[PDB]
């Protein structure tokens, strides 16, 4: 059971501006990692999956790096609709895992 | 219970992974770890065959290539270069083979690992062809020191091009691969020349048969047909979906690339023993 | 494109058996396995335990080892999944989520809410 530890709890920022939110895995998940953002009451949508490929149609802000334990999650220019929930799970080891969720808003 | 995976069907497929439109079902996902990739070889999938192939072929011609360094230097006439133009071809197999099957096992990396091994695919091939020409050089203008140095420095100048080419980026635009195509051309058409020159400096009829020019007529025309058997991605293209695993065109590819370099083996061994037991002279009978 | 339809919410009593549904369409239904997530309120994403609708197999969280139940209807492409012995802890959004190769969730469900207590 590989925990992971998103961070942080909360954020908040501006249109425009940029944003990173990391996860930390307990064990080595070897890039099997995907970032999903969730808004309220909705399902939630992949962002990224294998650590760095972006999904098909996801806007080219989202981008994720990192490697072995240590993985980030980058947002460019801040949109209006990027507000919600955003959580990382590691596909690697079963059971598989999710970070707690990042909570996102925007001013 | 870690590294679990399922293939795929060719539709849900990256664009890097896309190279084969005949192979409906059957693929790896990607899957950016090399434990994974290894992993794979002993599972089925659409490139368990074309990582063997090459596997058993680079362990087959390793196997081979050692073997015949440890010949007794009693056997060879001049050991030293004699046992080093054969350690070049037996050296340009294994590399060749042993970046076929890697370049097989980490395909479903990651686009970047896929991209590197695939460069060092190509770059294993021109050297293949430079190893097999270095022998062939040898054992056929063995009583001519000038034309052989010449076509050796033209092979080894358009192969060390060919490698080049392939490897440096800013190259892959639309309208530098023509050159690429270029030197790999200057490259594989290299061995008509020394081919006649050498059918024509001593008599057809013997170069036919006891000349083993006819061995090197065989594993040339095993070479055309498996490349035209790879582009026209044949038995696959009239049968889609029915050659996914096994029997694709990139295999027998692969084993006509591991015959045609046995029958140059062969061809050359046998261009040797007859320069051992004969020939030789030039201008005396006494 | 791939749609996955669940089933409406779900309002019961302790110790009730409830079962969610997850409709298939867009996709041949055994390429991928399916896998389920629970979200109680105000928390985050758990793994319930995905299926082989292939082999017809499953693995299960330890978390949900007699809880959960994972059936399949391949010719109506549809997959359920069952809870019994409910308690108050298990109140929560019950997804259903497709993979691809490796285990990333690119589809899922509109969720199915079920809710305990007694009344
Ligand atoms: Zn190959």
């Given at each position: 059971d590989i925990q992971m530890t998103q961070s942080p709890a909360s954020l908040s920022a501006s249109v425009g501006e940029t944003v990173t939110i990391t996860c930390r895995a307990?064990?080595?998940?070897?890039?099997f990692l995907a970032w999903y953002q969730q808004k309220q009451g909705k399902s939630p949508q992949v962002?990224?999956?294998?650590?760095?490929t972006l999904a098909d149609?996801?806007?080219?802000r989202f981008s994720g790096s990192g490697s072995g334990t240590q993985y980030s999650l980058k947002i460019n220019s801040?949109?209006?609709?990027?507000?919600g929930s955003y959580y990382c799970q590691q596909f690697?080891?079963?059971?598989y895992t999710f970070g707690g969720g990042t909570k996102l808003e925007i001013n | 219970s870690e590294g679990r995976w399922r293939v795929i069907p060719?539709?849900?497929?990256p664009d890097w992974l896309k190279?084969?439109?005949?192979?409906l079902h059957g693929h790896r996902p990607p899957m950016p770890s090399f434990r994974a990739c290894f992993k794979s070889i002993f599972r089925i999938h659409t490139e368990t065959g074309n990582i063997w192939t090459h596997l058993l072929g680079f362990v087959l011609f390793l196997f081979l290539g050692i073997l015949t360094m440890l010949?007794?230097?009693?056997?060879?006439?001049?050991?030293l270069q004699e046992k080093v133009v054969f350690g070049m071809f037996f050296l340009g197999a294994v590399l060749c083979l042993s970046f076929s099957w890697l370049f097989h096992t980490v395909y479903c990396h990651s686009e970047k690992v896929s991209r590197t091994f695939s460069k060092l695919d190509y770059s294993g091939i021109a050297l293949l062809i430079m190893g097999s020409f270095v022998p062939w050089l040898y054992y056929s203008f063995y009583c001519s020191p000038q034309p052989r140095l010449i076509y050796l420095s033209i092979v080894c100048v358009l192969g060390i091009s060919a490698i080049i080419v392939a490897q440096?980026?800013?190259?892959?635009?639309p309208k530098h691969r023509q050159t690429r195509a270029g030197v790999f051309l200057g490259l594989g058409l290299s061995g008509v020349v020394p081919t006649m020159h050498f059918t024509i400096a001593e008599g057809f009829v013997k170069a036919t048969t006891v000349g083993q020019m006819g061995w090197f007529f065989l594993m040339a025309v095993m070479y055309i047909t498996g490349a035209g058997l790879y582009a026209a991605r044949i038995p696959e293209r009239?049968?889609?979906?029915?050659?996914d695993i096994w029997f694709q065109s990139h295999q027998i590819f692969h084993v006509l690339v591991v015959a045609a370099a046995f029958v140059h083996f062969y061809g050359v061994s046998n261009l040797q023993e007859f320069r051992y037991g004969l020939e030789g002279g030039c201008t005396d009978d006494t | 494109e791939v749609l996955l339809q669940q089933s409406g919410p779900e309002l019961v009593k302790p110790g009730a058996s409830v079962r969610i549904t997850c409709k298939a369409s867009?996709?041949?239904?055994?390429?991928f396995n399916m896998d389920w997530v629970k979200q109680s309120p105000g928390k985050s994403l758990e793994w319930i335990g995905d299926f082989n609708p292939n082999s017809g197999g499953s693995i299960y969280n330890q978390k949900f080892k007699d809880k959960a139940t994972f059936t399949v209807d391949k010719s109506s492409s549809t997959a359920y999944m069952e809870l019994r012995?409910?308690?108050?802890?298990?109140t929560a959004v019950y997804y259903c989520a497709r993979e691809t190769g490796?285990?990333?969730?690119?589809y899922w469900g509109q969720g199915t809410l079920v809710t305990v207590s007694a009344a």
């Open positions: 307990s064990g080595n998940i070897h890039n962002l990224v999956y294998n650590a760095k149609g996801v806007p080219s801040l949109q209006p609709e990027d507000f690697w080891s079963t059971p | 060719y539709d849900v497929l190279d084969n439109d005949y192979l010949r007794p230097n009693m056997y060879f006439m001049a050991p440096w980026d800013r190259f892959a635009t009239f049968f889609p979906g029915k050659f | 867009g996709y041949t239904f055994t390429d012995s409910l308690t108050f802890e298990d490796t285990a990333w969730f690119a």
